[PDB]
Amino acid sequence: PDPSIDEVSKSDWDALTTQEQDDIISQVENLSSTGWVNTSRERKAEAIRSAIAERDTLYSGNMSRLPTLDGDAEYFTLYLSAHKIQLFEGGEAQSESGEGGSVSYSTGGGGEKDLQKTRYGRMALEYVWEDNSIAALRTY
Amino acid sequence: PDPSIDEVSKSDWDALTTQEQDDIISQVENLSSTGWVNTSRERKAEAIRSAIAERDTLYSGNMSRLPTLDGDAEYFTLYLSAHKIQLFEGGEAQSESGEGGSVSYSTGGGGEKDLQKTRYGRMALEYVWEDNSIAALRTY
Amino acid sequence: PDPSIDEVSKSDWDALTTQEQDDIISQVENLSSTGWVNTSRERKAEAIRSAIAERDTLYSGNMSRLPTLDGDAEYFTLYLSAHKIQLFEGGEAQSESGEGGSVSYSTGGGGEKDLQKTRYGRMALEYVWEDNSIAALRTY
Amino acid sequence: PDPSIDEVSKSDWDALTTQEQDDIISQVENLSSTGWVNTSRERKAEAIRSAIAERDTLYSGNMSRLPTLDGDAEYFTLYLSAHKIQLFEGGEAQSESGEGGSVSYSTGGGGEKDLQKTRYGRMALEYVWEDNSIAALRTY
Amino acid sequence: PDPSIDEVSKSDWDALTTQEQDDIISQVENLSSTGWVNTSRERKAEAIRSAIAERDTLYSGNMSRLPTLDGDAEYFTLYLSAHKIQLFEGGEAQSESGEGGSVSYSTGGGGEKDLQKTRYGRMALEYVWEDNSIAALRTY
Amino acid sequence: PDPSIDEVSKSDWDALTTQEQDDIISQVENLSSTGWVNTSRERKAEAIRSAIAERDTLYSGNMSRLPTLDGDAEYFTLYLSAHKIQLFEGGEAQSESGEGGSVSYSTGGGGEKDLQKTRYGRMALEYVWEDNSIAALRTY
Amino acid sequence: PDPSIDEVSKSDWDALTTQEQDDIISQVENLSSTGWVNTSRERKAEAIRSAIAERDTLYSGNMSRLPTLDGDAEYFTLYLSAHKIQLFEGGEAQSESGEGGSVSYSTGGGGEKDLQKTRYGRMALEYVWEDNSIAALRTY
Amino acid sequence: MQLRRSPGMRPMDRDWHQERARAREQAYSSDLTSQFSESEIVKYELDTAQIDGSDNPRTYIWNRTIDLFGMNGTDVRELRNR
Numbered sequence A, B, C, D, E, F, G: 001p002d003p004s005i006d007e008v009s010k011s012d013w014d015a016l017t018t019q020e021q022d023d024i025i026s027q028v029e030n031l032s033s034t035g036w037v038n039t040s041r042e043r044k045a046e047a048i049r050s051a052i053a054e055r056d057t058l059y060s061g062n063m064s065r066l067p068t069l070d071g072d073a074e075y076f077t078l079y080l081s082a083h084k085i086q087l088f089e090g091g092e093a094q095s096e097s098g099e100g101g102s103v104s105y106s107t108g109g110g111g112e113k114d115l116q117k118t119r120y121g122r123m124a125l126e127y128v129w130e131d132n133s134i135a136a137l138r139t140y
Numbered sequence H: 001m002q003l004r005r006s007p008g009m010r011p012m013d014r015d016w017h018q019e020r021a022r023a024r025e026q027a028y029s030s031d032l033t034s035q036f037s038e039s040e041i042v043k044y045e046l047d048t049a050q051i052d053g054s055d056n057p058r059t060y061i062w063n064r065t066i067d068l069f070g071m072n073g074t075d076v077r078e079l080r081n082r
């Protein structure tokens, strides 16, 4: 995308043209083979806007002068967006069944906290020190 | 929305026009792919009014001079609203089955506390230090 | 409502007109998508009268000079009322099944005390320090 | 009711007119959405008489200078009565199934003492310090 | 009843008229919605006679200077009678099924000792310090 | 019965008339709603004779000068007889299923020792200090 | 029986008439409602002869000058015989099913050693100090 | 014969004086039932002690919720105008 998702804050996202937003939405839709096609644009826009806001407020600043967002900020915001979209769709599918057969997935009862609950969240979590507390500070 | 959900307190919500409320309701409805379309307008209004009241009373104030609501207050109030609407609908579905197929969602709870019981609550809980007690205070 | 549920005690509730009570009943009915329509008015009135009584007798007073009811007293009483109605209806449904399909809800079953046993009770429990005992007192 | 259930002893219950008893029975029947309509009057009278007797012998007196019945004595005696009627009906239904239609309730392994074994009993238990032993005396 | 169940010992029960015994039997039959109507008079009389004997021998005398039967002796003996009848019927039904549907009760566990093993026994047990050993004694 | 079951030892039981034995058999048969009607007289007689011998040899003598058979000796011997008859029938049914109709009983667990393995045995066990070892002696 | 089962050793049993043995066999058959009618005389005789031999060799002598067979030797030997016959029939049925219905018994996880594995053995085991080792001896 | 608890003897008992003083110092009101056990009321004849809360030091002590001036524990019957 022309403005990349790591280059826009919440107010910038609101100021983008529809095409600049659609380029970013299109990029997020690449993170699932289904593209979440049955979920409307405004839900995908809400997920991305929320991921931008949550990056800038929960996954910003420093720990021992190291950035708290240590990985690529583009892919972190895209995975954080995909995590949100998947939760708006109701969560992971653990098992799916119908006329076309049945499949069961290695979701395996992932842990208590928000980002642990989906595959996209588990990817995003590696970009931010796995939510660990390595901050240190001194008196002078 | 024209006034944003973080800019309004409980009395302000009551003072809004129906249109300003319906804009905030429409924003909350983006957080589910189903839009909770079978719940009536009054129930969505009650959930938002409750989320605003609960933010201002339970998730306000300072904690070692840090604000207790550390994340974006807009998205916090929206996730707390979506959490309430989902609890008015029942719980989260762990599984859904019928004429057209079956699914299971891996929505196993992180614990017994209310916010832990739905995906929206688990998201909201990251905005507020995960309900931890980092307050500290001195004599002078 | 004209009198709000936090403004009325047990004796005041008995003194209200049918309409003033029906406004409060109608507000409690907003907390469920089903509104508990198949439960009669007397039972909803009894649940509210009982919730008001418990607020004033079990969840009143002070605790280390802090209020015990730390959250909004309106929503606390409404959630406590919803908890009672859901228990008069036999409890939380963990699962429901029939001709219209099957659903299973993420209740988890980890709750063992009264307020822990339904979603409305778990919400109400946040307003009252989660039943924790932070009272403190001194000699002079 | 004209005399309230907290105002009457076991001897007083035996001295009431049938109408005064029926008003109190009608109040107890408000605590279930089914009203226990298939359980006869004599059994509901026996449950209430027993609840009054058990209040005045077993949940009476003081622990330190504090009363052992801390909550509202009306709703305590009603919940204790409802607990008894539900045990005369065979206990809590954990699950019910009819003509295909099926439901399962979140009752769980709630405990092993009497009051822990029903929803009404768990409610009643919060009025009586949860059967805790905070009694204290000193020598003079 | 004319003589109450707490006013009769085993030899008194044997000396009662048939009508005086039938009044007490009728009172015990109130403690079940079913009345145990398919269990014969002799069996209900044996259960009551046994409850009277067992009260006077196992649940009598002091602990410290407290009576070991703390609660109402009438309702204790009635619950102990109902407990015995329910054991003569084979124990608590945990689950029941037939043409008319299925129900499962929350009567799981029930400890290991006899009184723990039915709802009437669990009720009776509260009248008698829960079978705890609070007796103290001294030299002089 | 004219001679009571607690008044007869093993030799006395053998010396009784058939009618005196049949009166005691009739009393034992009151302890089950089924009366064990499909088990023959000789087997009910053997169970009683055995229960008498069992009492006189294993549940006799003293602990700390207290009698070991603390409860009523009549009902102890009857419950011990009922325990034996139920063991001659194969033990307790945990579940019974017929022409569609099914029931399951809260008779699980208990323990590994014989009296723990049926309801009658669990009752008999309370009459004899629950098989505890409270004997004590001095030297001089 | 004319000679009782406690009066005969293994050599005495071999010297008995068929009628004297048949009286003892008949007495053992009283310990099951089925009488083990489908197991032949030779097998019941073998079980009794083995029970006699095993009594005299394994359950004889003294502990702290107490006899190791503390209960009635007659009933001990009969229960030991019944234990053996039930093992010759394959052990305790835990569950039985067919065209006549289904039943499941509360035999359960009875224990790992020989006598623990049947109701008759669990009975016999109480006559012999539950196989406990309370022997004591001194230097002069 | 007179026991220590016998009604004619109570005024001679050092404990009867000491615990009546204790009760006066410890009450908030004349309403004995809400404050004392039936044992205390009978043994120390508390109906006849002038119990009313006026001799409890805590009746007169400042016990403010926010105390800027470090002034809690001050007793008003020690002010210069008393």
Ligand SMILES: [K+]
Pocket: D140, H015, H018
């Ligand atoms: K003293």
Ligand SMILES: [Mg+2]
Pocket: A057, A058, B070, B071
């Ligand atoms: Mg922060």
Ligand SMILES: [Mg+2]
Pocket: F057, F058, G070, G071
């Ligand atoms: Mg012995």
